[PDB]
Amino acid sequence: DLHRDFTVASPAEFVTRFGGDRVIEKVLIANNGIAAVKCMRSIRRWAYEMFRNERAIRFVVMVTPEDLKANAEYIKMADHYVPVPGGPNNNNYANVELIVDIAKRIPVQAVWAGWGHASENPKLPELLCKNGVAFLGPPSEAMWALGDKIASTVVAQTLQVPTLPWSGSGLTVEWQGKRISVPEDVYDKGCVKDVDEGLEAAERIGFPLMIKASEGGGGKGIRKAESAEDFPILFRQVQSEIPGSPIFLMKLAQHARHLEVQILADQYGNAVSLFGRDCSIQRRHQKIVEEAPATIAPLAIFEFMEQCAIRLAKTVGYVSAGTVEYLYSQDGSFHFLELNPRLQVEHPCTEMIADVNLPAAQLQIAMGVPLHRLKDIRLLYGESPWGVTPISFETPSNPPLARGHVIAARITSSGTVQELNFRSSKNVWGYFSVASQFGHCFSWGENREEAISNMVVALKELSIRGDFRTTVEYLINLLETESFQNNDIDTGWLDY
Numbered sequence: 321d322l323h324r325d326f327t328v329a330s331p332a333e334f335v336t337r338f339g340g341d342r343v344i345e346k347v348l349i350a351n352n353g354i355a356a357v358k359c360m361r362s363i364r365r366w367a368y369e370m371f372r373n374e375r376a377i378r379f380v381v382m383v384t385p386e387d388l389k390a391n392a393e394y395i396k397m398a399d400h401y402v403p404v405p406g407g408p409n410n411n412n413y414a415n416v417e418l419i420v421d422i423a424k425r426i427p428v429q430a431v432w433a434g435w436g437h438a439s440e441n442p443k444l445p446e447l448l449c450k451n452g453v454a455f456l457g458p459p460s461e462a463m464w465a466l467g468d469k470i471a472s473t474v475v476a477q478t479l480q481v482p483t484l485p486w487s488g489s490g491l492t493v494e495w496q497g498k499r500i501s502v503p504e505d506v507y508d509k510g511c512v513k514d515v516d517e518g519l520e521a522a523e524r525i526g527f528p529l530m531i532k533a534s535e536g537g538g539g540k541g542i543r544k545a546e547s548a549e550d551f552p553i554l555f556r557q558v559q560s561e562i563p564g565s566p567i568f569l570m571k572l573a574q575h576a577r578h579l580e581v582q583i584l585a586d587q588y589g590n591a592v593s594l595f596g597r598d599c600s601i602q603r604r605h606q607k608i609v610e611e612a613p614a615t616i617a618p619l620a621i622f623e624f625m626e627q628c629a630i631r632l633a634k635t636v637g638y639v640s641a642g643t644v645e646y647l648y649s650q651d652g653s654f655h656f657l658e659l660n661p662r663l664q665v666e667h668p669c670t671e672m673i674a675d676v677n678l679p680a681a682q683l684q685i686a687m688g689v690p691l692h693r694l695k696d697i698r699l700l701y702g703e704s705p706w707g708v709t710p711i712s713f714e715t716p717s718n719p720p721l722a723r724g725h726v727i728a729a730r731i732t733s734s735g736t737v738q739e740l741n742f743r744s745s746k747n748v749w750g751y752f753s754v755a756s757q758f759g760h761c762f763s764w765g766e767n768r769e770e771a772i773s774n775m776v777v778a779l780k781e782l783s784i785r786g787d788f789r790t791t792v793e794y795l796i797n798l799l800e801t802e803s804f805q806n807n808d809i810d811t812g813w814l815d816y
């Protein structure tokens with residue numbers, strides 16, 4: 321029944337009839353592949369629901385010579401495209417100044433970067449803002465305040481959120497508005513400038529521990545120390561790899577689970593949690609199997625993790641979608657790990673159990689629309705689809721519940737994407753991107769067992785094909801293990 325569907329004539333009427341302040345009808349996508357297809361597809365569906373016009377919000381995509389040559393699907397999907405230099409991403413998708421120049425010349429009113437590339441570079445929203453261009457993500461001020469790993473951990477401690485023992489343990493900031501910030505003098509105290517103090521901090525932290533360079537990433541500038549004897553060599557190896565960068569130390573995550581809490585915030589300080597996900601099964605800094613919601617931790621503890629994630633977001637003035645990752649231990653304790661100031665490729669797991677269109681939520685949020693005025697958010701909280709009545713996310717009268725269970729798996733064998741459909745289960749969707757390479761499969765079920773079963777069946781179907789006639793066999797064995805099937809806490813060995 322569609323009789324109660326409310327629609328407007330255009331983006332302008334939507335913004336005015338929904339308490340927004342900025343009209344966005346043209347968006348520049350600084351990304352390709354599945355990210356670009358996903359972004360356009362999600363928002364277009366929303367445009368159909370709100371304007372009965374799938375193309376009400378036009379899209380412009382950045383295209384490299386390579387992508388255009390392989391006639392990537394995302395290109396044809398866009399209303400317009402702008403050819404850009406090829407080569408590494410620093411010459412295109414991750415080039416902050418290039419993205420901005422394009423956004424202004426078209427011009428568009430907003431930019432979406434997705435994940436990867438420049439999506440976590442605070443200078444992007446910073447430069448966009450200075451040019452009157454909205455960003456479908458957190459503001460630079462929100463990333464400057466949350467800062468890196470050092471800053472955010474310090475911030476977490478200030479809000480009294482448990483953290484792992486590190487060279488910054490105990491540091492806190494002094495804490496109406498005005499987001500929290502970390503003084504440079506406080507920050508430096510969390511870094512180690514030399515082997516000598518590095519050895520003193522490592523003694524109290526205890527081994528094994530990680531020596532990390534904040535400016536480092538993607539397996540770069542990281543090193544694991546097992547003893548005070550190897551510390552010096554390792555510490556200096558990090559200096560050599562990423563010279564001139566601040567360095568901190570952190571206790572190594574023993575046998576813990578990794579839980580993430582999905583966050584969504586508006587431009588008025590409101591924020592809500594969209595349950596969370598479990599990404600414990602990893603293979604050397606790589607999410608292999610993910611579940612939603614998370615169920616390994618008791619609901620009351622997990623709700624506490626949600627409360628901490630929201631306080632952390634509000635205090636720094638976060639805006640848009642984001643993820644707070646926690647470490648859950650065998651006992652029952654948890655510690656803040658980090659906060660991903662952007663959407664991740666696995667956000668659909670959350671979209672499915674919360675029936676929330678994340679990309680469309682991002683777009684409306686950047687238009688100035690308050691959380692309580694988002695249809696999906698109102699329904700999640702059991703309110704009227706089009707009501708204007710504010711919602712108490714703290715103590716709601718209609719406890720929001722997650723619908724079903726989701727299992728996502730990374731599969732392995734540019735901008736070209738291949739949609740995978742299975743004759744087995746109509747409740748599974750997938751894709752993969754040729755260089756071949758990787759992709760992801762997503763499975764839904766009324767409960768965890770049916771979600772796992774649907775996944776196993778679709779994966780068995782993939783094995784039949786040539787490309788994945790072996791590489792997906794380890795996932796099927798993993799998914800059908802007793803320990804996984806029984807949803808046990810001790811499954812760190814599934815990593816092998």
Ligand SMILES: CO[C@H]1CCCC[C@@H](c2ccccc2)OC(=O)[C@@H](C)[C@@]2(O)O[C@H]([C@@H](C)[C@H](O)[C@H]2OC)[C@@H](C)/C=C/[C@H]1OC
Pocket residue numbers: 357358361362365668669671672675676677678679726747748749762763764
């Ligand atoms: C690249 O586009 C793919 C992406 C599929 C992603 C996985 C899939 C899924 C999740 C879990 C298990 C199985 C399948 O998620 C979904 O279908 C749901 C959650 C969702 O993403 O659908 C999209 C939006 C309405 C919205 O963003 C969200 O709805 C709330 C629509 C536009 C479908 C897009 C697809 O196009 C065919």
